[PDB]
Design a protein around this ligand. Structure first.
Ligand SMILES: O=c1ccn([C@@H]2O[C@H](CO)[C@@H](O)[C@H]2O)c(=O)[nH]1
Ligand SMILES: O=c1ccn([C@@H]2O[C@H](CO)[C@@H](O)[C@H]2O)c(=O)[nH]1
Ligand SMILES: O=c1ccn([C@@H]2O[C@H](CO)[C@@H](O)[C@H]2O)c(=O)[nH]1
Ligand SMILES: O=c1ccn([C@@H]2O[C@H](CO)[C@@H](O)[C@H]2O)c(=O)[nH]1
Ligand SMILES: O=c1ccn([C@@H]2O[C@H](CO)[C@@H](O)[C@H]2O)c(=O)[nH]1
Ligand SMILES: O=c1ccn([C@@H]2O[C@H](CO)[C@@H](O)[C@H]2O)c(=O)[nH]1
Ligand SMILES: [Cl-]
Ligand SMILES: [Cl-]
Ligand SMILES: [Cl-]
Ligand SMILES: [Cl-]
Ligand SMILES: [Cl-]
Ligand SMILES: [Cl-]
Ligand SMILES: [Mg+2]
Ligand SMILES: [Mg+2]
Ligand SMILES: [Mg+2]
Ligand SMILES: [Mg+2]
Ligand SMILES: [Mg+2]
Ligand SMILES: [Mg+2]
Ligand SMILES: [Mg+2]
Ligand code: NA
Ligand code: NA
Ligand code: NA
Lengths: 251, 251, 251, 251, 248, 251
């Protein structure tokens, strides 16, 4: 009745079949408050859960935490409660020279640099978004006036070595990931983040519609540091975009 | 100056940057004749090459042969000659009950059951189309009156065991592929074909735009045998759709 | 230096070189209050950070969130701030019939059913604890009156299919994990949890000492969803154990 | 009982249990005309099929197209019609410095750089010819006065990156294949082609007799694109050799 | 000068470039005694080393022990001492119903169910013999009266689960190997043994000529000491005649 | 009641449930003579078998030969005859600069660079010793006054390329093992040997207790050659340690 990790019931969802799923629990209330009649439902672990109304339809907002494992729990438990459509809104590091801080990226497929995707489909299976969700995300992002890029996202189980960061305690990156950022750059991959491979593989193989849109908070090829103002704005724009994409998915 | 397998030069293409790539050499002239001023350029091995004009712009039509290996040669040599966009038009076997003979399927991602895709990117990389191509294919299919489905395609290096056919000389399927059709069915995969994993992986990792649309010529769950009239009309519909998708990509 | 996710500086840690790392942010304060002079340091995302004093030495308490990815961030950032010893205290499902709810399990090695361990060492590398940490954990468990088991732990990037749970939205488990619980049971594996493979592999390959002790909240011989009744008592026992193990590691 | 792709019946084969299988459809008629009573049977896609008589016995000649996938279809469909012995005659690039254009290479085993072989046997299985076929090819080649080499062949699903060619559109080779040509050279591998791994693994695991003889059209210690001038004479030599090898296999 | 494990020098081999390599140290002297002037050179661990002369050419006989790891040490150290051709003579279990106890099997390729082969070449590389050795082994086997089969051999790092034996302490076989004997049977594999994948992969990727001939001592679908001892005697007569064919 | 390779019966073992398993047949008699009433039982292939009495309890001493394959046979056949605890005493090459010739290493986990471990458990499974055995080995080693190290061992199916030795016939190491010694050094791995991965994986997945202690006979980072004197003392100390560890394992 009450799902084990999220701490909500189906009735708590007031009929919602669509969820917006940010990684950060603090983003949940901010998203819900862009909609009508936001209601705090539960907070346990990394899972903060709200409901709100969008054009008269109930929508759930639930954080995932960082990484495929905590994401897979949230998606599973929301699906048990009747949710069928999942819109991730994230932050991301761009790896292409002119994909700038404050731009939006809508993932068309993910490099599966994760482990949880393999718990739903073998590696051969594409970590692909639902076409309708990706279409809605692209439309919402473009209509907002943001600069939007569609393309492949490298989705890593780590922030540090799997994104080929060397400014770390050991200063070492395992053989598998040595040279990997340049490899992805040369293959036209746009960005790194940490949940899309699990989310897209799990949903595409389980009868659930999913997509990922993320605001660029750092460009690994740029040396200029964004300010708080640009970042706040990037975060605000990303949540307005994902709510508009949700509007486009409702029926 | 003339590429080794296709036997054409850049000048022969008259400025074409877009190619339509059927599997079957006999389909090339049929596609070219839906366009203006079709001219035969070359035929070597499985590669029949025509040029034509679509809304005043040059377009190449070039067969790939069956399979990723022969496809990879055609795409590479056309890219050497300035082609940047590749629209595959194919035939396919549907594996879902209500995806009927005569319908069109636009691949949104491929299960990489091939070998050539791994010569361009490791297995983790998604075999996904260019989003604009997939969008153009869906619109062109709808506008032609076809019944169209968007979704995941299983792309196999074999027609027989990799599509879990038992009606064969040995009657056996290696362990890897035992139960695989039901596995993909339960994961929502729509169809089997034999070139999309290579094509989409090669192009998405190499700066080229690609997509795949295919006419359903058999449904592996249905007992009814489709007519000859049905299969001819399916091929004719698929080529009308791919040419209209090309038109959408050119402006 | 202020680390990117934890939001603390090295000076904030008051010279601590040992951290206690529960999964659940709410367990952090409870652990800190078994020690002297607990002080809240920061809370961001799934990371709640306290410090305290044990026998006159500073100790950090920091949550990891669920899964290898969020654990890998906490461990990395704490190691950047001088932490060298990491004691995970967790919850776990037993897969051997005579391990009871409320028992403690100290992992002697993990089955790497995760992805983040591969971002530190190839699969051949053993997910093994530091021997002193495992020894201290066993002694602390015995001395606290707990029933303790030493053995191999299956460490999964999912709660659901990677632990072969079938009471789920789809009711399916991917091929890889079909039969896996009985496989591990027959191999003598004691339990499932979700962070030890990442933690132990990253620490054993990076010059950091780690171990994992977890309280049994469910026996998978009975059911899949843990009972809420016993959670508080089991958690209270496990945190008494881990603080006493920390005491043993401080000398 | 016309097979799906080849367009021939068992009666068309006139009792043939041996097939000569070149890659290039244009080579089929040339091979058949070295025998008695050549008869054209069909041409569909990359499959041109002739029958002829050798020492009074029927032989079938059928092209495979480039790559494992199209080869696998031809072998299966021929086996359905009673063919049990398959002699591939190919073209190849030598990787050893003193294996010269115009030499013949008889494969004793293939490096499985393909995908279709895995649709018949897991990677551990050897891509090995039938001993009688290899013995016949060596004898035919030596008796003809050709310069012949026996050894391992690297059999690739691509012409370009899997043969470590760099004079391409991207100029890049994926990590897996970087340094691979020198690796095979140092291991004594003789040559690159594109069908033997599939053909030999499929046949050796399916009760069929197969081998591969190929004429060297380029030496890769020199250059990447084969010279046109020497193609005709090398091919003429190779097909004389394969017809004699077929004579030896008959009785 | 003196290799690390075998305990012999290059001069001890008297110019030999061919070695006969049985698995069992007790078989070494038996092989050397089919040749001229057999002399014991060393015994350390599983490595018993003799030299003899065949048609006036020095030949070395050296056991490998069971498994790829010990085999790889012997081959490497013999190669350091100038050996270039390696003839394995083994025992084997047949898995095809009419490959009988006492028959000889000459491996044309091995299923690599081992680990040491991967220390010389990636899994894609074929574990295949040198063609001249396989040809010499077939001719020697035929010319000695044996019933000989040419074909694929499954070469396992274990005697028990990797050959899908269930008559064991746990009675279990790991998932990877469940159904595997029937899989190989259906693929036409002739036999199981424990060294050919390592030996053939190592040699084919290192400029060394190698082959494997083995006497069938058990059929997994279907014997006496007299049968079993006759089988070993036939196998070593075959391998020595194959060496003669390789020398001149 | 007579196993296939070891040539002993259960009655020959006189009730022993514990075996000391050196690699070298010549070491067996030396170990047995440290105990009471040593009795030679059999010698076949690399398997020399003795029994003796330790504190009035029968113990078996049985060599394994070099490598996981011959080890796996010895362990299996001894387990069939009632042995449940296996103490390996080995020689080893240290790879860390201050792990000196004559030191003792007790393995806490093995890098599985072998093949036979995969015949008992998939690669994800940890090659870890029984905790009681590792505890007894550490105690026996430290009480002897030796310099003892606990840590990870790289366990290789080869002495030469898998330990990244270049002073060889070819002077080459396959790509997999290029750079591998430095990789393990930087990961804190203490040493190379050739049986622990198979032994520990087999036993930990089969209900048998196992551990490995080894005397350092070479340090891959030191140029000084140890004396014959130092090596003989090292062997003598290693066998006294393993016998004392055995004493500790008997109730
Ligand atoms: O360079 C970056 C920036 C952001 N993230 C996202 O931010 C979180 C952690 O910083 C994760 O959920 C991840 O998706 C990255 O992975 N990499
Ligand atoms: O069930 C079917 C029908 C068609 N095809 C397509 O038809 C060709 C072979 O029949 C290939 O190019 C492939 O893409 C299939 O793979 N499977
Ligand atoms: O059956 C169980 C019980 C608990 N956990 C632990 O509890 C959290 C999720 O419930 C994770 O951090 C995990 O380590 C499991 O994985 N499985
Ligand atoms: O360097 C060369 C020369 C020839 N081929 C063969 O020729 C065709 C492609 O040119 C394929 O069928 C392949 O087997 C190669 O792969 N590589
Ligand atoms: O069924 C059998 C019979 C014999 N051997 C051989 O005999 C030794 C072990 O019994 C090994 O060297 C191996 O090659 C087997 O592997 N399996
Ligand atoms: O550098 C060394 C020293 C010793 N050994 C051990 O000695 C035997 C071979 O020399 C094997 O059993 C192995 O465990 C090594 O592997 N490497
Ligand atoms: Cl879709
Ligand atoms: Cl795109
Ligand atoms: Cl340790
Ligand atoms: Cl054969
Ligand atoms: Cl050869
Ligand atoms: Cl244990
Ligand atoms: Mg690189
Ligand atoms: Mg199944
Ligand atoms: Mg099973
Ligand atoms: Mg055969
Ligand atoms: Mg099976
Ligand atoms: Mg390196
Ligand atoms: Mg155990
Ligand atoms: Na998390
Ligand atoms: Na083809
Ligand atoms: Na051995």
């Amino acid at each position: 009745k009450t799902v084990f990790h999220l701490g909500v019931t189906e009735a708590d969802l007031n009929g919602a079949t669509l969820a917006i799923i940010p990684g950060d629990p603090a983003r949940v209330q901010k998203i819900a408050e862009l909609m009508d009649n936001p209601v705090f439902l539960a907070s346990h672990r990394e899972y903060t859960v709200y409901r709100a109304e969008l054009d008269g339809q109930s929508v759930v907002v639930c954080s995932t935490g960082i990484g495929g494992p905590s994401t897979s729990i949230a998606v599973e438990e929301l699906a048990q409660l009747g949710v069928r459509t999942f819109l991730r809104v994230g932050t991301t590091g761009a790896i292409q020279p002119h994909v700038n801080v404050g731009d939006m990226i809508v993932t068309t497929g993910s490099v599966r640099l994760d482990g949880a995707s393999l718990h739903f489909a073998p590696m051969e299976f594409p970590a692909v978004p639902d076409f309708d969700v990706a279409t809605a995300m692209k439309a919402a992002a473009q209509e907002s006036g943001a600069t939007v890029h569609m393309g492949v996202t490298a989705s890593s189980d780590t922030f540090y070595p799997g994104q080929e960061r060397y400014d770390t305690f050991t200063g070492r990156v395992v053989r598998r990931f040595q040279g990997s950022m340049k490899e992805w750059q040369d293959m036209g991959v746009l960005n790194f983040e940490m949940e899309s491979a699990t989310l897209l593989t799990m949903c595409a193989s389980s009868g659930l519609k999913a997509g990922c849109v993320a605001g660029v908070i750092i460009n690994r090829t740029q040396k200029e540091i964004p300010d708080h103002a640009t970042l706040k704005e990037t975060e605000a724009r990303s949540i307005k975009v994902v709510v508009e994409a949700a509007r486009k998915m409702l029926k």
